[PDB]
Design a protein around this ligand. Structure first.
Ligand code: 486
Ligand code: 486
Ligand code: 486
Ligand code: 486
Lengths: 232, 232, 231, 231
């Protein structure tokens, strides 16, 4: 079985191991210390995303400016969706599993300024629970999130990009079929999953101001983008 | 000799090894790719600074909010000063040695938008050449840059901070005396070195807008601080 | 093309990056210092081999005892073969243990260096003579993991046999990409699998030196069936 | 207080963080699997010891051959002593090889486990009996690096002798911090250095098992002066 490799079995081998936050649990929580730790963890996960993306079949065949562009547009999609997946696998409670040593449960979301950020991220794990997403579906979906936005005037390797995206869409279809439902159910599930991918644009739009804000505060001490939607 | 440890011999053992940028030299340069690489390298160096600071004698005895505060205020001071040191040790040319595999020489500073950033960082290496700073002087100076700003209303462990800073000032004095000049020359050199530390406030003020700008562009795809000056 | 994955393209993505030896070039060379450095580089390469093997499609499906057994038998096969490849790609007749630790002609004169390095240079020269491609090499290295089993067999013998047969077929596919006719592809499979068979002799000549370095520099002092392609 | 650095506070900053074994707890234990895991953990701990030693004030000033010689003689001393410490701090009579690989009472029953672990548990129980402090432990571990030299001497013998005498004095300073009177401090120095001397016996009992595991699981098959504190 594994002796006949598919695209998704390749995506499974290139998925990196979870990073630990390094958060000291022996000291009282504060929003300050959590957010500082998440900023450093966020930077490390961006590094992991670059290495991951370069291993995706097809990605390194795009023009180098295209690769940089897709990673710049999509990194928050990848991060929020992967966070959703870790939270979904951790528990059926309403929590965010940023790292195995930094889990934000309902208690920690009572800390000042935490909940209004976390509610947009909890939407992702809630959708994953509702749809009972499998690991192979998730892997295909996460690759597609890398391919979710392009410049309004197009990529340099636009024709190749279109072939790559269409292929990972097909791969998501095969992952769905593996759930052994019937054709009518597979058809509807494709809608459900790709609707979730579409809604990630809104998740990210709502999270970007908070990323901006924490940069201004803790680091600085202070239209041209086309969304590739599955459903209009 | 090394069998009698001093504070500076401790600072020498906790100094981390240089990070590599991972920059592909087989592909033409562009400002885009350099800046993207420097942003990722910058985040990794912040991680290194946190680990370093926690090993500095005295630092972990400050209140945890004070530690976070000092690292938040000073990280750009540490980064620009260490960059100055690596550039100063690399060559007497006007270059910035961000990493052994990413050196910005006069040629690469002709790339668009590069020089106006780099001129503020070249000031640091030029001052190091002018003063022929030793490694032990540098190590003491870099610790002092961690201690270069505090909140207007003070730190939680203000009294302990004052003792720590005064001790690393004394340690810089001992490093100066090791150059085996006479007392009149040692006195003047203390002024020269601490004047350079003072001027780092202006270096950082000039670099922060460019950090802000690259965050807005490549990441987002878009008064309460007292300076501790040596000379008024 | 990469959008249609093959076993060999999976083998290409799990191939680990080359390790550096950490050898100080600014100090006079010494047989003592090279061998100590290689002992520590060797231990790190074992670690890399365990992680690589666990990602080989099919390998994790074998019984855990089988996994451990195949890694114990084959680690020196894997290391010498990969060394041959690195040396062939880096070129002349030089052993390229790491980018910062190359046994050049001068270092060969050091005592006991040549008598060890001669068996390893054989691997590098055969790879050069046969003009082995990267995809052939990756299939061959996987086969070396599967080159020896216990006399009594493995606990997952039936699965092992399927796994090994599949990577044999995968080496055939890599051979066919060299664009020869079928008669030449058949003959090239012989040439490549002869080299694989000859690794048993290479290894048997290298194990004593490994043993003596362990006794010297670390302690300061039968039931295995070879799976040969050609009898 | 840290603002006045001592040799022992430098030893505290260069002490490496504990390594994890990577041992899968969700699978049935096996003597085979524990020993293979410990073999790879051992190799990684050697790497940590080399980096640690190069940062010991004075060590890099010895001749490079001396450095290599002291590390070859002493690595098992360092590993067993640090294991004793980790086990003493972590609890009962348990060997704490890594946070994820503890030899509990059940794992002791596995074949050949106890006969090895008994010599290592001796180290842990002595540390407990003597209530060794962390600063005493760090000085003692450094002395173990300096516990054996070649019969003919070292190339930097005079410097070595100064280095060793300085860490002997540093263990004395750590003893004095326990706030006993001078007569008790004198006697505690005897007790601690007796334990150091007894590591030679511990190691000599552990080397054979290291040898046999190497022959079994890796190959699949005099001129040294002990520097004793008490004759
Ligand atoms: C709690 C919380 C929070 C947030 O402010 C909103 C979304 C978070 C982001 C994505 C979801 C996310 C997932 C992770 O596992 C790491 C942390 C993380 C973040 C955080 C983050 C902070 C800074 C960066 N930089 C600039 C690259 C990247 C990520 C914190 C974010 C912004
Ligand atoms: C060329 C150039 C340039 C700059 O835009 C001005 C100063 C640079 C900064 C300090 C000097 C400096 C030294 C280094 O060695 C790494 C790179 C580096 C930087 C860069 C940087 C970018 C992003 C961050 N984040 C937000 C933590 C940190 C550092 C690039 C900076 C800002
Ligand atoms: C020069 C030389 C030499 C040799 O003594 C002969 C074969 C070498 C071996 C395989 C070929 C080889 C390839 C490498 O790239 C690393 C080094 C290496 C070695 C060395 C080695 C030493 C000890 C171990 N242990 C016990 C796990 C593993 C590898 C050195 C070896 C034995
Ligand atoms: C249980 C058990 C056992 C033992 O066989 C006896 C002593 C162990 C040794 C020292 C005590 C010790 C402490 C550790 O924390 C790691 C493991 C360890 C070992 C093991 C070891 C095996 C091989 C090497 N090589 C050859 C460098 C190094 C260390 C296993 C040893 C030999």
């Amino acid at each position: 079985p594994q002796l006949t490799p598919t695209l998704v079995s390749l995506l499974e081998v290139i998925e990196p191991e979870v990073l630990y936050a390094g958060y000291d649990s022996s000291v009282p929580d504060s929003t300050w210390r959590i957010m500082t730790t998440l900023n450093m963890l966020g930077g490390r996960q961006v590094i992991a995303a670059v290495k991951w993306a370069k291993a995706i079949p097809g990605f390194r065949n795009l023009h180098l400016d295209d690769q940089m562009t897709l990673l710049q547009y999509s990194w928050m999609f990848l991060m929020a969706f992967a966070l959703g997946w870790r939270s979904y696998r951790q528990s059926s409670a309403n929590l965010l599993c940023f790292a195995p040593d930094l889990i934000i449960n309902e208690q920690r979301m009572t800390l000042p300024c935490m909940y209004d950020q976390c509610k947009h991220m909890l939407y992702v794990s809630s959708e994953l629970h509702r749809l009972q997403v499998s690991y192979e579906e998730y892997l295909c979906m996460k690759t597609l999130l890398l391919l979710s936005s392009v410049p309004k005037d197009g990529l340099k390797s636009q024709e190749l990009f279109d072939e790559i995206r269409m292929t990972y869409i097909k791969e998501l279809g095969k992952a769905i079929v593996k759930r052994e439902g019937n054709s009518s159910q597979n058809w509807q599930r494709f809608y459900q999953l790709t609707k979730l991918l579409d809604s990630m644009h809104e998740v990210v739009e709502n999270l970007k101001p908070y990323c901006f804000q924490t940069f201004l505060d803790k680091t600085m001490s202070i239209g041209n983008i086309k969304k590739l939607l599955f459903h209009q």
